[model samples]
Target: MEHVAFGSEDIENTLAKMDDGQLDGLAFGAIQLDGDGNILQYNAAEGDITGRDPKQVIGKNFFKDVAPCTDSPEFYGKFKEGVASGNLNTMFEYTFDYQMTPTKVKVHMKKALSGDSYWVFVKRV
Candidate 1:
């Protein structure tokens, strides 16, 4: 498997360094999560892509917030299992029924050694 080495602190600092200018044109949602799927970072670029603002989605249980489709005991549980068993990267596609608009996207999840959490990067297709 391909590996991407990242430290939690390294990711955190990278986030802090982002400026508004850098955020404006991004259509991909940059999200971070813990081992249990707890959300830590959900950026404005994501908000723009999903049509939901950061204030509304931040701290909200992501498995429940936007993708209950993934909240099932099996999907997320197996996902965690993969991560625990040394699978550093996972890719999946999901469809969302967002109030009025329908959305389809691809997701990438990966974790760091701290075991604190990982990140979710999304692209609308």
Candidate 2:
């Protein structure tokens, strides 16, 4: 079967409709967090891409535990600013190289229109 790419309009709509557990079946990395950065949803593809077990990350603080590299002024800063301002549909490219090997990835972040949660969608580039 041909897989539809994440970040496309169709997939974006689909993701918005899916619950946390449903995200596990996605083909690309997806991480959902609350306004305070606690992990709410983590998909299987994300675990495979980051080489982390879902068990290790779920219910943890994503910015502090899973990706402290992002706790800096750029990545986490943007996340905070977006959620704080309540206008968080943004995308950019970033490189991750803290504890693990360096990898380039596309980062997409958005806040739920009706909830207190935020989502980060990642795709290795």
Candidate 3:
């Protein structure tokens, strides 16, 4: 996560300041979500990595419909916990194997500092 700009110590502030255009320009995948996990912004890199169209993912439930593999205690659970507590900035390694082949990647979850949205950052490891 060291090389990822979104992983900075002030990540929440950085992400909160960036708009959809800025996020899409990043080299890694960036998926923005509402408090209940509904997709708000799905960046180009994320669509490329997941092989999904932004149109298809924008209004869907991310953890349940788009990426159900993460709808578990280890991932979604932590997301919910973060939202509930209003403090979420965690990063870890995860293997994504749903709706496609298994791929090892780093998962970064962070709650926006200024809004009710959260972000999921993904980059192949």
RMSD of each: 6.2, 2.2, 2.6
Tens digit of lDDT per residue, candidate 2, span 6-90?
6665455567767666787777888888999999888888888888888678899989888987897778999999878976877
Residue 58, model 1: Cα distance from true site in angstroms: 2.1
* Model 1 misplacement above 4 A: 1-27, 73-75, 98-100
Q: Quick one: ranking by TM-score, best first?
A: 3, 2, 1
A best-first ranking of the candidates according to their lDDT comes to 3, 2, 1
Per-model CA lDDT versus the true structure: 0.62, 0.81, 0.85
Q: For candidate 3, what is the lDDT?
A: 0.85
Residue pairs clashing in model 3 are: none
TM-score of 1: 0.66
Clashing pairs in 2: none
TM-score of 2: 0.87
Query: For model 1, what is the alpha-carbon lDDT of residue 108?
Result: 67
The digit string of per-residue lDDT tens for model 1 on 1-125 reads: 11222223354345444544453344567776766666666777678767777666657777766667676554576567766775556667776664737788777666644456666767777
Tens-place lDDT digits, model 3, residues 46-81: 888878988778999998888888989999999999
How does candidate 1 score on lDDT? 0.62
Per-candidate TM-score against the hidden true structure: 0.66, 0.87, 0.90
Error of 3 at 72 (Å): 0.8
Off by over 4 Å in 2: 1-4, 10-13
How many clashes does each candidate structure show, in the order listed? 0, 0, 0
